[PDB]
Ligand SMILES: C=Cc1csc(CNC(=O)c2cc[nH]n2)n1
């Protein structure tokens with residue numbers, strides 16, 4: 205945890221707060237913010253913030269004493285008076301709780317406000333924030349993130365309906381990391397997808413994007429592990445199953461003499477009984493721009509497997525699994541320059557999906573293939589895509605009907621999680637019969 209006696213640089217704040225001391229600790233800062241047990245500091249370290257990336261909410265307040273525009277990286281702008289029209293703080297804070305609860309309940313057990321701090325945002329916290337000792341929800345065992353003055357009760361993000369204060373938020377000022385120049389000039393160095401439209405929400409979006417760029421694009425820590433909040437395990441199991449299925453059938457159908465497996469340096473053979481000559485080539489997850497095939501690269505013999513090795517243009521003799529950054533899920537967070545921050549056990553920033561990368565390939569059709577014995581150890585199954593000896597013979601046996609439906613469920617899970625599959629144009633399932 206971050207010592208409250210650590211120094212906070214105040215130069216960023218001196219425009220909204222003329223005369224602010226240069227010599228400043230977090231202790232004195234919190235006191236100036238109007239605030240006074242498991243919550244040692246409202247501010248956290250970059251390391252703590254990285255561990256709670258899912259909780260990150262970029263936050264900016266803009267002035268014109270007169271009204272204030274509060275912007276958040278969700279896209280919401282609220283106007284408080286002492287896009288939405290001006291309203292007093294006692295109704296504004298109700299909206300802040302509802303918005304953070306709906307955004308974060310399926311993501312994290314807290315909120316981390318990510319700031320490019322110039323003053324108003326920090327002096328505005330006293331109007332919708334309360335702090336105190338760590339607590340638990342009144343209705344469950346999750347830690348409390350909201351408080352209600354109507355009933356003097358605490359709630360987590362799931363049980364906060366009607367609550368009016370944010371309780372024990374965390375926060376981090378990006379301007380402490382040692383930057384030169386304003387927010388827009390540092391953000392626009394790495395990103396063109398987020399504009400500067402002179403609304404507070406635009407600043408909040410840029411601030412979070414810059415943070416993510418610094419902590420996951422330029423710097424990368426794959427040792428950090430993140431809790432399970434979803435179907436992580438079923439998704440990862442489904443990916444290994446689809447990988448085995450698709451490569452096995454591609455070898456059986458086209459009988460490539462060699463396979464170039466390009467990507468993770470710890471990859472293992474996904475079809476260990478295949479006759480082919482299996483050759484590995486090491487590349488780590490690219491976090492910034494897609495690899496250039498010319499730098500990566502007889503790759504024109506046999507087939508190339510690119511299983512989450514994002515390249516700019518796949519060769520024509522490839523099998524490919526590429527993550528689609530546009531997908532909406534609790535695992536996939538907005539990232540930098542169209543990229544997305546996929547957090548499933550580990551945090552993988554991923555360059556933006558680009559359909560031109562697949563120009564030499566086609567989409568891979570669903571199919572189930574099996575050469576296993578028809579032995580069991582219900583509604584009868586009818587499908588043209590169940591490629592088994594039994595379907596060839598007229599009637600799908602029960603074992604293969606069960607496995608087909610399991611494989612379809614895993615296939616559909618992996619697609620819905622954002623993954624997309626692409627194959628060489630000559631792939632043809634008829635060749636497997
Ligand atoms: C209603 C009060 C109010 C205050 S400021 C504002 C509009 N926001 C900006 O001009 C701005 C500058 C940087 N980001 N946003 N509205």
Ligand SMILES: [Zn+2]
Nearest residue numbers: 341344360363
């Ligand atoms: Zn609860």
Ligand SMILES: [Zn+2]
Nearest residue numbers: 395398413541
């Ligand atoms: Zn950006």
Ligand SMILES: [Zn+2]
Nearest residue numbers: 578594601604
């Ligand atoms: Zn069968």
